[PDB]
């Protein structure tokens, strides 16, 4: 099946991030994962001070790696990502385009659900 990867790095502009992306692509190709495309979300700002490997990070970027990984290499990829130092965090999430958009008609006013008690004068 298809999966995604929200890769989070530190602040290195070009060389170190390119090297980490090269290492990730090599690991994916060695673990039997066909890399499709790559989406760059740009260097943004972290919503909170993260405490990953050793140092505290407060200014990192985001990357998206699209690939087709089998159902036996996900744990190995997670271990390889956790073993990295320049990688803050990264969860392997399946691709959202697999689940198609289900059709709907909206809401509907539910009537008064009667027929719950007896009809005695009491």
Partner 1 sequence: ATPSLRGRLARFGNPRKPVLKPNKPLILANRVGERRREKGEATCITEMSVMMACWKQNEFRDDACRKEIQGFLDCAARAQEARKMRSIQETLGESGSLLPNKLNKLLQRFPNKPYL
Partner 2 sequence: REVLQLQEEVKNFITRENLEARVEAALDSRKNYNWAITREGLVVRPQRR
Partner 3 sequence: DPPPSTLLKDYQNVPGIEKVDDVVKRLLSLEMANKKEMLKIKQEQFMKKIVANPEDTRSLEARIIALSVKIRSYEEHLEKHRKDKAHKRYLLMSIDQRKKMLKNLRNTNYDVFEKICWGLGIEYTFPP
- Note the residues at the interface with RNA (CB under 7 A): 1, 3, 49, 51, 56, 71, 74-75, 91-94, 115-118, 120, 122
**Is the Cβ of residue 43 or residue 74 nearer to partner 2 in the bound state?**
43
- Minimum CB separation from Zn ion for residue 110, in Å? 17
Strand 92-94 to strand 3-8: parallel, antiparallel, or no bridges (unpaired)? antiparallel
- CB neighbours of 54 closer than 8 A, spacing ≥ 6? 85
Encoded one letter per residue, x for contact with partner 3 by CB under 8 A and - for no contact, window 82-121 reads ----------------------------------------
**CA–CA dist 121, 38 (Å, integer):** 72
Binding mask 85-114 vs partner 1 (x if CB under 8 A, - otherwise)? -------------------------x--x-
Q: Which residues within the stretch 97-116 sit at the binding site for Zn ion (CB under 5 A)? A: 104
Please list, in sequence order, all residues whose beta carbon lies within 8 angstroms of the beta carbon of residue 25, skipping any fewer than 6 positions away. Answer: 35, 65
Buried b (16+ CB within 10 A) or exposed e, 40-62: eeebeeeeeeeeeeeeebeebbe
Cβ-based nearer residue to partner 2, 14 or 120: 14
21 binds partner 2 (CB under 8 A): yes
């Amino acid at each position: 099946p298809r999966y995604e990867l929200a890769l989070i790095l530190k602040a290195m502009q070009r060389p170190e991030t390119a090297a980490t992306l090269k290492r990730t692509i090599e690991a994916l190709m060695d673990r039997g994962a066909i890399v499709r495309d790559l989406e760059n979300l740009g260097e943004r700002a972290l919503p909170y001070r993260i405490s990953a490997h050793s140092q505290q990070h407060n200014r990192g970027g985001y990357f998206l790696v699209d690939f087709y990984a089998p159902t036996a290499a996900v744990e190995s990829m997670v271990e390889h990502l956790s073993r990295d130092i320049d990688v803050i965090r990264g969860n392997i999430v399946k691709h959202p385009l697999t689940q198609e958009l289900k059709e709907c008609e909206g809401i509907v006013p539910v009537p008064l659900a009667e027929k719950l008690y007896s009809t005695k004068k009491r």
